[PDB]
């Protein structure tokens, strides 16, 4: 099963926010067969739930270093995709 | 070294910020081959030249939807690694 | 005898790996807790107050 879950490596967010982000990423990836389309669906879910505008970076190879705000940040791996999504504003 | 030729197929960002980020990315790629360090340098240069805050990500197999500000989301690839400097705000 | 010994040596190595994993996980958790406490102190009480 395509599980976009995470372990305790670097996950600094509200628990509900992190669970919703992981679930939205997994649902978008299941709904869309393309990476860009899954990104579009996940961004639509993010802009609907945590308001506009929120982005999530998820892929096999990636890297993020920015101003990760408190209770809305993540830098981990969600399945085969590296879940590095931090929301600030 | 590394062919740090940033060909922006889709450049929905400021031309000056994109050119400065491309020059910084070429210098960083000449310095080292760390894509994470290159993305961090691009994000830092974009945030310094266009205020806080700017985020840039470099990877190989990833699909992300940019939720950024206007004239600040530069997606320039030095080859195939799409270094998308989507300055969120 | 050498086969059982190689098995025992692999078992000792794996047990050492597990024990070192426990010790290193405790150390990493303590370091993460201390770093989180310092970051929370900095975020709540700004140094340039």
């Amino acid at each position: 099963m395509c599980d976009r879950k995470a372990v305790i490596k670097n996950a600094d967010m509200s628990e509900e926010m992190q669970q919703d982000s992981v679930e939205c990423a997994t649902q978008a990836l299941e709904k869309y067969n393309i990476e860009k389309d899954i990104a579009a669906h996940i961004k639509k879910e993010f802009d609907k739930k945590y308001n506009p505008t929120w982005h999530c970076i998820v892929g096999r190879n990636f890297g993020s270093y920015v101003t990760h705000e408190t209770k809305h940040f993540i830098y981990f791996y969600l399945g085969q995709v590296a879940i590095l999504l931090f929301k600030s504003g | 070294m590394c062919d740090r030729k940033a060909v922006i197929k889709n450049a929905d960002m400021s031309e000056e910020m994109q050119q400065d980020s491309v020059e910084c990315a070429t210098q960083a790629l000449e310095k080292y081959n760390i894509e994470k360090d290159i993305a961090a340098h691009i994000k830092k240069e974009f945030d310094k030249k266009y205020n806080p805050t700017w985020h840039c990500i470099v990877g190989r197999n990833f699909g992300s939807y940019v939720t950024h500000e206007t004239k600040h989301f530069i997606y320039f690839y030095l080859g195939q690694v799409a270094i998308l400097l989507f300055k969120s705000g | 005898v050498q086969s059982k010994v190689n098995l025992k040596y692999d078992s000792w190595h794996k047990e050492v790996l597990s024990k070192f994993g426990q010790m290193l996980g405790s150390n990493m958790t303590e370091f993460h807790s201390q770093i989180s406490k310092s970051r929370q102190e900095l975020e709540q009480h700004s140094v340039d107050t």
Binding site: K9, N10, A11, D12, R60, N61, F62, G63, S64, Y65, V66, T67, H68, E69, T70, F73, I74, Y75, F76, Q80, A82, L84, F86, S88 | K36, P52, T53, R60, N61 | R39, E43, S46
Partner: peptide, 17 residues
């Protein structure tokens, strides 16, 4: 006003192995 929280989540991201 509200400031900007510089609580960076530092973790090195490796490629697929």
């Amino acid at each position: 006003p509200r400031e900007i929280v510089t609580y960076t989540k530092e973790t090195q991201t490796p490629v697929m192995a």
